[PDB]
Design an enzyme around this catalytic site. Structure first.
Site, PDB file in Angstrom:
ATOM      1  N   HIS A  71      49.604  46.679  42.749  1.00  0.00           N
ATOM      2  CA  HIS A  71      49.137  48.021  43.142  1.00  0.00           C
ATOM      3  C   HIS A  71      50.274  49.016  43.372  1.00  0.00           C
ATOM      4  O   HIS A  71      50.453  49.558  44.460  1.00  0.00           O
ATOM      5  CB  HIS A  71      48.238  47.940  44.371  1.00  0.00           C
ATOM      6  CG  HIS A  71      46.889  47.395  44.064  1.00  0.00           C
ATOM      7  ND1 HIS A  71      46.455  46.173  44.516  1.00  0.00           N
ATOM      8  CD2 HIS A  71      45.896  47.882  43.285  1.00  0.00           C
ATOM      9  CE1 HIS A  71      45.242  45.937  44.048  1.00  0.00           C
ATOM     10  NE2 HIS A  71      44.881  46.959  43.298  1.00  0.00           N
ATOM     11  N   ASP A 220      40.394  51.653  36.058  1.00  0.00           N
ATOM     12  CA  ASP A 220      41.028  50.796  37.044  1.00  0.00           C
ATOM     13  C   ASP A 220      41.265  49.394  36.494  1.00  0.00           C
ATOM     14  O   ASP A 220      42.336  48.828  36.670  1.00  0.00           O
ATOM     15  CB  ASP A 220      40.155  50.720  38.306  1.00  0.00           C
ATOM     16  CG  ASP A 220      40.948  50.397  39.572  1.00  0.00           C
ATOM     17  OD1 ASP A 220      42.183  50.265  39.517  1.00  0.00           O
ATOM     18  OD2 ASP A 220      40.308  50.289  40.645  1.00  0.00           O
TER      19      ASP A 220
HETATM   20  C1  3KB Z   1      39.661  36.731  39.159  1.00  0.00           C
HETATM   21  O1  3KB Z   1      40.501  37.723  38.568  1.00  0.00           O
HETATM   22  C2  3KB Z   1      40.261  38.968  39.111  1.00  0.00           C
HETATM   23  C3  3KB Z   1      39.578  39.320  40.203  1.00  0.00           C
HETATM   24  N1  3KB Z   1      39.413  40.612  40.641  1.00  0.00           N
HETATM   25  C4  3KB Z   1      38.697  40.935  41.802  1.00  0.00           C
HETATM   26  C5  3KB Z   1      39.176  41.899  42.664  1.00  0.00           C
HETATM   27  C6  3KB Z   1      38.490  42.235  43.805  1.00  0.00           C
HETATM   28  C7  3KB Z   1      37.309  41.592  44.092  1.00  0.00           C
HETATM   29  C8  3KB Z   1      36.825  40.629  43.231  1.00  0.00           C
HETATM   30  C9  3KB Z   1      35.549  39.902  43.492  1.00  0.00           C
HETATM   31  F1  3KB Z   1      34.670  40.016  42.443  1.00  0.00           F
HETATM   32  F2  3KB Z   1      35.792  38.564  43.662  1.00  0.00           F
HETATM   33  F3  3KB Z   1      34.886  40.325  44.616  1.00  0.00           F
HETATM   34  C10 3KB Z   1      37.517  40.307  42.092  1.00  0.00           C
HETATM   35  N2  3KB Z   1      39.945  41.697  40.002  1.00  0.00           N
HETATM   36  C11 3KB Z   1      40.635  41.471  38.932  1.00  0.00           C
HETATM   37  C12 3KB Z   1      41.218  42.570  38.242  1.00  0.00           C
HETATM   38  C13 3KB Z   1      41.487  42.745  36.903  1.00  0.00           C
HETATM   39  C14 3KB Z   1      42.037  44.043  36.806  1.00  0.00           C
HETATM   40  N3  3KB Z   1      42.115  44.657  37.991  1.00  0.00           N
HETATM   41  N4  3KB Z   1      41.614  43.739  38.842  1.00  0.00           N
HETATM   42  C15 3KB Z   1      41.654  44.010  40.207  1.00  0.00           C
HETATM   43  C16 3KB Z   1      40.740  44.893  40.732  1.00  0.00           C
HETATM   44  C17 3KB Z   1      40.802  45.181  42.077  1.00  0.00           C
HETATM   45  C18 3KB Z   1      41.763  44.587  42.872  1.00  0.00           C
HETATM   46  C19 3KB Z   1      42.666  43.699  42.331  1.00  0.00           C
HETATM   47  C20 3KB Z   1      42.616  43.411  40.984  1.00  0.00           C
HETATM   48  C21 3KB Z   1      40.849  40.089  38.390  1.00  0.00           C
HETATM   49  O2  3KB Z   1      41.497  39.910  37.376  1.00  0.00           O
HETATM   50 MG    MG Z   2      42.388  50.387  44.647  1.00  0.00          MG
HETATM   51 ZN    ZN Z   3      43.630  50.448  41.208  1.00  0.00          ZN
END
Ligand code: 3KB
Ligand code: MG
Ligand code: ZN
Length: 315
Positions: A71, A220
């Site tokens: 981030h 994003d």
């Molecule tokens: C398992 O791999 C991944 C899980 N999450 C994720 C993030 C938050 C909640 C959850 C919840 F669904 F678990 F709640 C899953 N985000 C990504 C991702 C891919 C690109 N940005 N981004 C991201 C998006 C937001 C934050 C960090 C990374 C990811 O690659």
């Molecule tokens: Mg954010």
């Molecule tokens: Zn972001």
């Protein structure tokens, strides 16, 4: 720093590269602020913003991104680029207000991120959590953005009426808010209903606001839409960050969820496959149905999904 940026010109060989959705900024680090400037000129014009104030702004914004593994400033530029690419392929859709704000919103959408989710903040009683009960980090990101505008000679929106001023801050406010993944599920689900009943109407302001929400989330998450070698490495940056948040829970003596546990490196491929199916693909699928020109995102997202399957099955 801000004075030398005004004299920047983008090398000709990139003029056409930038326009593509799968363009990767990784190798152009010292040009990123220039690339943003470029993106604003093509997207609005040189007459749009005052160049002096715009350069101070981008440098302040840059300053307030932290040395976290994902981030950070690179991610803000990557996200901005994706929004640029969307806007250029949908030139007729947006008002002059929307175009400007949205690029600003993308740049600032994760200002002063510490590396922690909302859960970790709301669990262990962080001051920010006391201030902001819902969409914790996302409301802070907007705080930061407003505070940077209010510095001396940083208000890029000087040349707009009171009315036009509070419109664009509302666009920026809701855009940045929409970057919380908790709201994406509702938003996206509401939009599928409106499309399949055929009740979607971009003349309707609340329908526009939902769409912009989804565009934010598509931007994003756009690291899953780059070419495989870039997407692969960007994943290492995401998990490094997930795992650092997990090691803050291990320090107290608590096992975090499997996503944030570095003892389970081996399950990362399956984690990705799960994430593409439940989040990424429905996102770009729904985006594409509303904006067909954005089909290349969906195509790329699909290709990387396949790649993670090959990894899972040992290839
Ligand atoms: C398992 O791999 C991944 C899980 N999450 C994720 C993030 C938050 C909640 C959850 C919840 F669904 F678990 F709640 C899953 N985000 C990504 C991702 C891919 C690109 N940005 N981004 C991201 C998006 C937001 C934050 C960090 C990374 C990811 O690659
Ligand atoms: Mg954010
Ligand atoms: Zn972001």
């Amino acid at each position: 720093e801000w004075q030398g940026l005004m004299q920047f010109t983008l090398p000709v060989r990139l003029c056409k590269e930038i326009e593509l959705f799968h363009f990767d900024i990784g190798p152009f680090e010292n040009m990123w602020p220039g690339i943003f400037v470029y993106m604003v000129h093509r997207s609005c014009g040189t007459s749009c913003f005052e160049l002096e104030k715009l350069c101070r702004f981008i440098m302040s914004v840059k300053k307030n991104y932290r040395r976290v593994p994902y981030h950070n400033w690179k991610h803000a530029v990557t996200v901005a680029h994706c929004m640029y690419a969307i806007l250029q392929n949908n030139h007729t859709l947006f008002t002059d207000l929307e175009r400007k704000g949205l690029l600003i919103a993308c740049l600032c959408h994760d200002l002063d991120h510490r590396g922690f989710s909302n859960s970790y903040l709301q669990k262990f009683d962080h001051p920010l959590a006391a201030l902001y009960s819902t969409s914790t980090m996302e409301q802070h990101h907007f705080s930061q953005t407003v505070s940077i505008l209010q510095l001396e000679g940083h208000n890029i929106f000087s040349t707009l009426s009171s009315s036009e001023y509070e419109q664009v801050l509302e666009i920026i406010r809701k855009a940045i808010i929409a970057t919380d993944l908790a709201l994406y599920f509702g938003n996206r689900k509401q939009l599928e209903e409106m499309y399949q009943t055929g009740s979607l109407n971009l003349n309707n302001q609340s329908h526009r606001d939902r769409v912009i929400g989804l565009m934010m989330t598509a931007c994003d998450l756009c690291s899953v839409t780059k070419l495989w070698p870039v997407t692969k490495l960007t994943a290492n940056d995401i998990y490094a960050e997930f795992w650092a948040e997990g090691d803050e829970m291990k320090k107290l003596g608590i096992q975090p969820i499997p996503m944030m546990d570095r003892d389970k490196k081996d399950e990362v491929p399956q984690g990705q496959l799960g994430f593409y199916n439940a989040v990424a693909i429905p996102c770009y699928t729904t985006l594409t149905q509303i904006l067909p020109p954005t089909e290349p995102l969906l195509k790329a997202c699909r290709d990387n999904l396949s790649q993670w399957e090959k990894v899972i099955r040992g290839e």
